[PDB]
Ligand binder design. Sequence first.
Ligand SMILES: N=C(N)NC[C@H]1Cc2cc(CN3CC[C@@H](N)C3)ccc2[C@@H]1NC(=O)C(=O)Nc1ccc(Cl)c(F)c1
Ligand SMILES: *[C@@H]1O[C@H](CO)[C@@H](O)[C@H](O)[C@H]1NC(C)=O
Ligand SMILES: *[C@@H]1O[C@H](CO)[C@@H](O)[C@H](O)[C@H]1NC(C)=O
Ligand SMILES: *[C@@H]1O[C@H](CO)[C@@H](O)[C@H](O)[C@H]1NC(C)=O
Ligand SMILES: *[C@@H]1O[C@H](CO)[C@@H](O)[C@H](O)[C@H]1NC(C)=O
Ligand SMILES: *[C@@H]1O[C@H](CO)[C@@H](O)[C@H](O)[C@H]1NC(C)=O
Ligand SMILES: *[C@@H]1O[C@H](CO)[C@@H](O)[C@H](O)[C@H]1NC(C)=O
Ligand SMILES: *[C@@H]1O[C@H](CO)[C@@H](O)[C@H](O)[C@H]1NC(C)=O
Ligand SMILES: *[C@@H]1O[C@H](CO)[C@@H](O)[C@H](O)[C@H]1NC(C)=O
Ligand SMILES: *[C@@H]1O[C@H](CO)[C@@H](O)[C@H](O)[C@H]1NC(C)=O
Length: 335
Amino acid sequence: KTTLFCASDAKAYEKEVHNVWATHACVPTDPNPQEMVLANVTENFNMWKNDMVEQMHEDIISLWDESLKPCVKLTGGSAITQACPKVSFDPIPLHYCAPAGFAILKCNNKTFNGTGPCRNVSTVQCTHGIKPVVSTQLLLNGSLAEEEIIIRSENLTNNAKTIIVHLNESVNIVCTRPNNIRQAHCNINESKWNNTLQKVGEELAKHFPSKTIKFEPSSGGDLEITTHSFNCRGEFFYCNTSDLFNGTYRNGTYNHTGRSSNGTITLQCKIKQIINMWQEVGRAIYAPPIEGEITCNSNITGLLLLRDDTETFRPGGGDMRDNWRSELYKYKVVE
Ligand SMILES: N=C(N)NC[C@H]1Cc2cc(CN3CC[C@@H](N)C3)ccc2[C@@H]1NC(=O)C(=O)Nc1ccc(Cl)c(F)c1
Ligand SMILES: *[C@@H]1O[C@H](CO)[C@@H](O)[C@H](O)[C@H]1NC(C)=O
Ligand SMILES: *[C@@H]1O[C@H](CO)[C@@H](O)[C@H](O)[C@H]1NC(C)=O
Ligand SMILES: *[C@@H]1O[C@H](CO)[C@@H](O)[C@H](O)[C@H]1NC(C)=O
Ligand SMILES: *[C@@H]1O[C@H](CO)[C@@H](O)[C@H](O)[C@H]1NC(C)=O
Ligand SMILES: *[C@@H]1O[C@H](CO)[C@@H](O)[C@H](O)[C@H]1NC(C)=O
Ligand SMILES: *[C@@H]1O[C@H](CO)[C@@H](O)[C@H](O)[C@H]1NC(C)=O
Ligand SMILES: *[C@@H]1O[C@H](CO)[C@@H](O)[C@H](O)[C@H]1NC(C)=O
Ligand SMILES: *[C@@H]1O[C@H](CO)[C@@H](O)[C@H](O)[C@H]1NC(C)=O
Ligand SMILES: *[C@@H]1O[C@H](CO)[C@@H](O)[C@H](O)[C@H]1NC(C)=O
């Protein structure tokens, strides 16, 4: 369509990499909110062909390649070495704004599944504040569904299409490596995981009716996708989810078949140094983990699943563009 720019709310004094990159490439955020409503102005969206997603993907790649410089980067035959200094790392919201002569349409149907027509469409200058959170399996620190859970997918009958489950009630996940230096663990509440997976199962049954829904651990692939992986305070966490995606949904009953304990599920995690880059096909070797207790307290605001007589779903991810899509679904650049 055109070239979108970014307005952040970053502070220049901050040594945090997100703030630095933003203040160099993002303009200041406009204080007054310019929004233009419309009642019957029907319009069509396709989150899966959105170009905003591609632009933000480019900018996030530029961020990570300017901020989390690896000790070594293996791309094909090349091996590039740089300084890999540890750095303060905490995502900051970024808004994507339409330049002059261009608008951003925003679908206001609280149940829009990302494909097709929208009843209530507004006109804005900037998207809401989006946090470029890189993760797999679980979507972290996102915005929730205002009404009920939504199931987004390009083709719900194509096993290959990644399913984005968009929740309406966040679920607390706490991950920590306290004072093996790469051993860490995560805790989630078994009761709230109950409710979340049971309601996701109800919706998934709305879409797949006869068959009984099943949640199973990640089939196979690189460690970065067979586990819930993410960056926390700087370090790369890889966490096991087999005690998380592990239940069955039959006649409105979701029985969780994962190993809980005292009411909380813990996940075993390793802090790996050889990362399989999401930006491009290559590897990145980073410096050994710092000291202190590294801990992140995150919200599970979404899921990435992949289907395969009953229907079974597994944690997926890896195309970091799906993360951006999960937030830019309700937007479209126009004019
Ligand atoms: N080749 C390489 N080195 N990267 C390719 C990317 C692109 C893609 C695409 C599919 C899609 N699948 C469907 C069809 C299949 N062909 C592939 C799966 C995995 C992947 C890979 N993503 C990752 O590696 C990744 O995200 N790492 C990572 C690192 C740090 C953190 Cl914090 C994190 F959270 C994650
Ligand atoms: C969230 O979605 C579920 C399933 O669609 C629904 O039962 C619930 O009432 C919604 N709102 C919540 C949980 O606040
Ligand atoms: C999304 O909703 C549209 C109608 O708005 C429908 O045509 C399409 O099949 C739906 N897709 C999914 C995966 O729910
Ligand atoms: C999804 O793929 C199936 C075949 O795999 C076929 O119905 C069609 O190509 C797609 N359906 C829709 C509604 O786009
Ligand atoms: C919900 O979580 C509680 C917490 O321990 C557990 O007792 C119960 O079995 C869970 N419910 C289901 C359906 O798994
Ligand atoms: C997760 O844990 C199970 C058993 O605890 C193990 O069989 C599986 O290989 C683990 N997966 C990864 C990626 O470590
Ligand atoms: C579910 O959890 C139990 C206990 O942690 C484990 O033995 C079992 O293999 C898990 N299910 C799957 C399908 O991995
Ligand atoms: C979190 O788990 C504890 C037990 O582990 C439970 O008492 C509490 O009710 C859970 N949180 C919510 C919101 O239910
Ligand atoms: C999510 O936000 C909280 C609050 O800023 C932060 O402590 C946590 O590290 C964030 N999680 C991720 C994965 O960025
Ligand atoms: C989780 O979601 C709540 C919802 O209001 C939000 O206020 C909070 O900042 C989010 N993050 C954490 C770490 O609680």
